[PDB]
Amino acid sequence: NLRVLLDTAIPPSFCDTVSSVLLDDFNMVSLIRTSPADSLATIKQDNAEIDIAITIDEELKISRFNQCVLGYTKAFVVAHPQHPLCNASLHSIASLANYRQISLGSRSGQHSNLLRPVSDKVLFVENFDDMLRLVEAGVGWGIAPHYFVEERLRNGTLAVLSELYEPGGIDTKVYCYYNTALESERSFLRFLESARQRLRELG
Amino acid sequence: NLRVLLDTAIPPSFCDTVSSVLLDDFNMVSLIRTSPADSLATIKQDNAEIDIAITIDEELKISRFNQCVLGYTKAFVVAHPQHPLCNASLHSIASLANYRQISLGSRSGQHSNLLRPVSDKVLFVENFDDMLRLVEAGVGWGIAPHYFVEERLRNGTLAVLSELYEPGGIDTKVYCYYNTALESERSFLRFLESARQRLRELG
Ligand SMILES: COCCn1c(NC[C@H](O)COc2ccc(CC#N)cc2)nc2ccc(Cl)cc21
Numbered sequence: 001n002l003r004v005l006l007d008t009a010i011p012p013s014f015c016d017t018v019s020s021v022l023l024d025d026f027n028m029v030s031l032i033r034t035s036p037a038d039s040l041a042t043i044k045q046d047n048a049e050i051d052i053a054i055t056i057d058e059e060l061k062i063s064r065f066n067q068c069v070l071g072y073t074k075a076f077v078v079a080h081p082q083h084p085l086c087n088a089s090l091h092s093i094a095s096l097a098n099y100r101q102i103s104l105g106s107r108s109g110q111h112s113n114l115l116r117p118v119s120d121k122v123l124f125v126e127n128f129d130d131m132l133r134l135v136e137a138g139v140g141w142g143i144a145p146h147y148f149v150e151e152r153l154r155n156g157t158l159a160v161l162s163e164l165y166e167p168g169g170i171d172t173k174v175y176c177y178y179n180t181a182l183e184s185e186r187s188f189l190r191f192l193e194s195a196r197q198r199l200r201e202l203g
Numbered sequence: 204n205l206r207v208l209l210d211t212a213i214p215p216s217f218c219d220t221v222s223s224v225l226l227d228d229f230n231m232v233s234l235i236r237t238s239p240a241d242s243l244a245t246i247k248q249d250n251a252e253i254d255i256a257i258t259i260d261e262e263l264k265i266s267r268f269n270q271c272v273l274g275y276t277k278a279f280v281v282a283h284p285q286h287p288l289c290n291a292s293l294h295s296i297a298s299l300a301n302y303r304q305i306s307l308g309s310r311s312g313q314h315s316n317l318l319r320p321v322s323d324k325v326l327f328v329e330n331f332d333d334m335l336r337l338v339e340a341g342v343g344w345g346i347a348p349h350y351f352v353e354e355r356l357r358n359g360t361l362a363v364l365s366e367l368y369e370p371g372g373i374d375t376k377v378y379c380y381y382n383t384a385l386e387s388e389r390s391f392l393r394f395l396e397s398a399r400q401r402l403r404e405l406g
């Protein structure tokens with residue numbers, strides 16, 4: 001049984017890219033969904049016996065796992081179109097650190113530099129739905145995956161704030177944390193090879 | 204006088220991209236070159252009076268500067284073609300943390316998570332030349348900008364180790380740290396707009 005973690009930030013397509021290839025080589029494949037904020041926390045619990053985590057979250061070296069880059073995805077800073085920081089930028093981008101942020105919370109209470117909130121006014125939720133609900137209502141601003149805001153952006157229900165910080169969305173590496181034991185196993189190298197070249201095409 | 208920091212990791216072309224645009228708007232422009240390992244350390248010294256730093260190094264918020272993304276460049280992990288970790292990977296990638304690393308040193312003695320050495324066996328130098336000299340000689344492995352190893356790679360003088368970690372080179376955001384005062388100044392927004400769309404073309 002190959003246990004596999006995919007965080008909520010990973011487009012649901014890339015999750016079909018993996019399972020397709022994995023099931024070619026492996027006979028039992030378990031797919032677990034975590035918050036980006038809980039991915040590395042989960043694999044660190046030995047009893048969770050995760051073999052592969054696909055997550056946006058970064059840490060220099062986890063005990064017994066190796067890291068590599070599967071590809072890249074795009075986050076966007078979004079708010080209600082009538083948000084103060086909306087319809088403006090550069091001073092707005094800076095002010096994000098003052099206006100209320102709707103942030104992914106974590107069981108560990110802790111965050112990475114990458115995922116920790118930027119604003120001194122933060123309201124925590126558990127997933128990107130509860131985030132973008134409290135954002136459609138103009139309670140604050142949030143940063144969420146492209147695939148979560150594509151629908152609402154063209155609808156005009158949500159507006160982008162991020163473009164002057166990073167045009168075309170904030171590029172974010174997708175990392176593969178794999179059990180060191182998979183290190184010399186064509187099965188896993190087949191997964192990387194395929195999973196990679198397929199997730200280029202989505203991008 | 205607009206003082207401008209460009210770290211050694213920034214291709215020398217992108218440094219012509221900036222100066223071209225900047226000199227269109229500004230009448231005195233000073234261009235300082237730093238180690239990536241010394242960029243943010245330098246702008247933090249108030250007396251250094253840096254107005255714009257273009258550097259690969261990341262920190263969540265520097266006092267009085269705002270951050271944004273200019274674009275992306277590619278580092279490669281390189282070694283002597285007869286290096287043990289050479290002509291191999293995945294276990295080799297993991298072993299990088301054991302074999303000797305030739306690392307950029309810093310006046311502050313300190314490094315960011317991004318720039319800190321990965322290996323327990325590290326020999327510090329001051330620039331990418333001294334790095335790739337001690338690497339051509341097989342004293343250790345190093346990670347250097349594409350533009351620094353393009354020549355030597357096709358020559359066969361150096362080999363890439365990084366490809367199974369991140370195919371096509373390890374993508375690295377180029378950051379613009381700009382004095383908050385430039386925040387609402389078409390001059391600076393002109394620089395970003397131009398500098399960005401021009402540095403897409405190099406990539
Ligand atoms: C840099 O984001 C990529 C990683 N990432 C986060 N991180 C949440 C942190 O609280 C930082 O949020 C920031 C918001 C604004 C700026 C400037 C502008 N504009 C910088 C950082 N949340 C994410 C959600 C989804 C994805 Cl794919 C990546 C995410």
Ligand SMILES: COCCn1c(NC[C@H](O)COc2ccc(CC#N)cc2)nc2ccc(Cl)cc21
Pocket residue numbers: 212259276277278280296299306317318319320321346347348349364365366368369373375
């Ligand atoms: C992740 O690198 C991008 C930032 N960056 C560094 N950082 C030097 C650190 O000691 C980490 O070196 C690593 C070497 C190997 C691996 C896995 C593989 N393969 C991961 C990290 N040095 C750089 C030099 C130039 C540029 Cl453009 C970026 C650099």
